[PDB]
Write a protein that binds this ligand. Structure first.
Ligand SMILES: O=C(O)c1ccc(/C=C/c2ccc(O)cc2)cc1
Lengths: 273, 10
């Protein structure tokens, strides 16, 4: 029974994360986030390793739930007549990266480097576990302000990672790649790299570069803030119009701009405390 | 200053 294992608290973020409520596990007072998803609104379904029919979001969350602090951990889930309930870990204190950038403006490159590196490691963990997130954006990244650790959240648009072409997409359009805009076709890794270029521009410029379809497909990146030549080069490479011209994750992490990253604790002490 | 906003996925 859900209501016996958890003391349920008020809505978190006034619905901005979805139907997510504060909670505490009665077993050990562990803080949790309790996310509700309506069966009627769930598009993609999968099966757990035993065979039970569950939302794809649960399948993907279970696949990445092993120990790496870079992705949000699913602690348990429950099925109800009309919905599924997901028990997620709740780091505290947190602020999501969208609100962080709004309040602080364009981030210093040392801080952007630390955040971007952690996002790359978290996305690599997903792919290593057979999961494609498909909605990487600052709104879906939580910052643990005390530990300087970032958490990727919201697998509600994700899919099993495959090497063949994707013809469906329900993530965020302004982070989606031009081959999706133009042809409704994309491959998972190179589309992820495009969204990471959007995210990195967002961090060092204070907002995303493109709002309209014509900007996404046009191939021009204007820098509205002072950004180093090395960082500009990485962003423009991630935002190559043709997917085969984009870097691999290995090439991103070996890029000159990515060298000498801060540790998470160093990041918190220099930039967050 | 420019207009920065969230974008729904869904
Ligand atoms: O996977 C998801 O969709 C998902 C959504 C939301 C959260 C956490 C939200 C949060 C945590 C702590 C707070 O103090 C305030 C808000 C985690 C995961």
């Amino acid at each position: 029974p859900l209501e016996s294992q958890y003391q349920v608290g008020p809505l978190l973020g006034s619905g901005g994360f979805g139907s997510v409520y504060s909670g505490i596990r009665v077993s050990d007072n562990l803080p949790v986030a309790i996310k509700h998803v309506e069966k009627d609104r769930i598009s993609d379904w999968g099966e757990l390793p035993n065979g039970t029919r569950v939302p794809m979001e649960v399948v993907l969350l279970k696949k990445v739930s092993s120990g790496f602090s870079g992705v949000i951990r699913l602690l348990d889930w429950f099925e109800r007549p009309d919905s599924f309930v997901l028990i997620l870990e709740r780091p505290e204190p947190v602020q999501d990266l969208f609100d962080f950038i709004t309040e602080r403006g364009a981030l210093q490159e040392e801080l952007a480097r630390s955040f971007f590196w952690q996002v790359l490691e978290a996305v690599r963990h997903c792919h290593n576990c057979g999961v494609l997130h498909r909605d990487i954006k600052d709104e879906n990244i939580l910052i643990d302000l005390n530990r300087g650790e970032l958490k990727l959240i919201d697998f509600g648009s994700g899919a099993l990672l495959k090497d063949t072409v994707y013809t469906d997409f329900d993530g965020t359009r302004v982070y989606s790649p031009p081959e999706w805009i133009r042809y409704h076709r994309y491959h998972g890794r190179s589309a992820a790299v495009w969204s990471l270029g959007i995210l990195l521009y967002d961090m060092v410029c204070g907002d995303i570069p493109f709002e309209h379809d014509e900007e996404i497909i046009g191939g021009q990146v204007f820098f509205r803030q002072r950004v180093s030549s090395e960082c500009q080069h990485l962003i423009r490479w991630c935002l190559a119009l043709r997917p085969s011209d984009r870097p691999t994750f290995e090439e991103i992490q070996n890029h000159p701009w990515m060298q000498d990253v801060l540790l998470p604790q160093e990041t918190a002490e220099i930039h967050l405390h | 200053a420019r207009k920065r906003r969230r974008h729904p996925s869904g």
